[PDB]
Design an enzyme around this catalytic site. Structure first.
Site, PDB file in Angstrom:
ATOM      1  N   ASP A   1       0.788  -1.192   0.000  1.00 12.63           N
ATOM      2  CA  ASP A   1       0.000   0.000   0.000  1.00 12.63           C
ATOM      3  C   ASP A   1       0.851   1.288   0.000  1.00 12.63           C
ATOM      4  O   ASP A   1       1.336   1.766   1.052  1.00 12.63           O
ATOM      5  CB  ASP A   1      -0.925  -0.024   1.226  1.00 12.63           C
ATOM      6  CG  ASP A   1      -1.948   1.097   1.223  1.00 12.63           C
ATOM      7  OD1 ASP A   1      -2.029   1.922   0.251  1.00 12.63           O
ATOM      8  OD2 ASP A   1      -2.721   1.106   2.204  1.00 12.63           O
ATOM      9  N   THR A   2       0.957   1.888  -1.188  1.00 15.31           N
ATOM     10  CA  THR A   2       1.656   3.131  -1.392  1.00 15.31           C
ATOM     11  C   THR A   2       0.949   4.331  -0.695  1.00 15.31           C
ATOM     12  O   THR A   2       1.535   5.405  -0.535  1.00 15.31           O
ATOM     13  CB  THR A   2       1.856   3.367  -2.902  1.00 15.31           C
ATOM     14  OG1 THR A   2       0.573   3.518  -3.575  1.00 15.31           O
ATOM     15  CG2 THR A   2       2.666   2.196  -3.526  1.00 15.31           C
ATOM     16  N   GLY A   3      -0.312   4.137  -0.307  1.00 14.87           N
ATOM     17  CA  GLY A   3      -1.094   5.151   0.370  1.00 14.87           C
ATOM     18  C   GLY A   3      -0.985   5.105   1.861  1.00 14.87           C
ATOM     19  O   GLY A   3      -1.632   5.895   2.536  1.00 14.87           O
TER      20      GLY A   3
END
Ligand SMILES: CCCC[C@H](CC(O)(O)[C@H](CCCC)NC(=O)[C@@H](NC(=O)[C@@H](NC(C)=O)[C@@H](C)O)[C@@H](C)CC)C(=O)N[C@@H](CCC(N)=O)C(=O)N[C@@H](CCCNC(=N)N)C(N)=O
Lengths: 99, 99
Positions: free
Chosen positions: A25-27
Site C-alpha cells: 500500500d503506497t497510500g
C-alpha cells in the site's frame, strides 16, 4: 518482481516468526499488522484513514521479510482487517511505482 | 514515470475541468475524491477503510487525467482526508509496483 494492480497486491511476509499475507500500500505511511502477541516495548498511536482511526501498538526495529526481501523498521499492531505494508518498509525493499 | 516512496506519491490530476492533488494508492480498490460537483447521475455507496466506513456518491465513466495520462472510470466523491487514486484508474494508466 512486478506486481500489477488488476487485483489487490497481496504478498507473503515473515514477521515475528510468522508467515502472513499483506497488502502493498503506497497510500500508507506506516505498516500495520493484525493482532500479534509479540514481545517488545511499545508506544500507543492512533492511525486513521477514511471514516476513522484505530488505536495501535507501535514497535520499532522489527525485522520484516517481504517476498524474500529483508526490511527492518516500525510496525504498528492492532485490529486491522488487512495487513498493510506501508512506505516505511516499501522503500527498504526498493519498491517503486511505474507508469 | 518511475516514482519512489520516500515521500507520499502525490500527483496532479484534472477531473471535471479542475486541477487537484491526489495520492497514488495501491491499497485502494477505488478512486475517492473530496466533495465536488461532477456530471451525470450518481448513486450512493458506502466504502470503508482501516478506521471505519463513509457514505460516498458514485459517478461512472468520468474522465480523469493523471499526470498527463488519460483515464475514464468510476470516481467516488465524499468525505476523505486525502484525494486518492485507486486501482481502478491505476490499471488504466498502466501503473505497476516493482521491486
Ligand atoms: C482494507 C484495508 C485497506 C487500507 C486502505 C488504505 C489507504 O487507501 O491506502 C489509505 C489512503 C490514505 C487515506 C485516505 N491510507 C491509510 O488509511 C493509511 N493512513 C495513513 O497513512 C495516515 N498516516 C497515519 C500516520 O495515520 C495518513 C492519512 O496521514 C493507514 C493504512 C494507516 C497507515 C483503504 O482504506 N482502502 C480502501 C479505500 C476505499 C476504496 N473504496 O477503495 C478500500 O480499498 N476499501 C474497499 C474495501 C477493501 C477490500 N476490498 C477488496 N476488494 N478486497 C472498499 N470497498 O470499501
Amino acid at each position: 518482481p512486478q506486481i500489477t494492480l488488476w487485483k489487490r497486491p497481496l504478498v507473503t511476509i515473515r514477521i515475528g516468526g510468522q508467515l502472513k499475507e499483506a497488502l502493498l500500500d503506497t497510500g500508507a505511511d506506516d505498516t500495520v499488522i493484525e493482532e500479534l502477541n509479540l514481545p517488545g516495548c511499545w508506544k500507543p498511536k492512533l492511525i486513521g484513514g477514511x471514516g476513522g482511526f484505530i488505536k495501535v501498538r507501535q514497535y520499532d526495529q522489527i525485522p520484516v521479510e517481504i517476498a524474500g526481501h529483508k526490511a527492518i523498521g516500525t510496525v504498528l499492531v492492532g485490529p486491522t482487517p488487512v495487513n498493510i505494508i506501508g512506505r516505511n518498509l516499501l522503500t527498504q525493499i526498493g519498491a517503486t511505482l511505474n507508469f
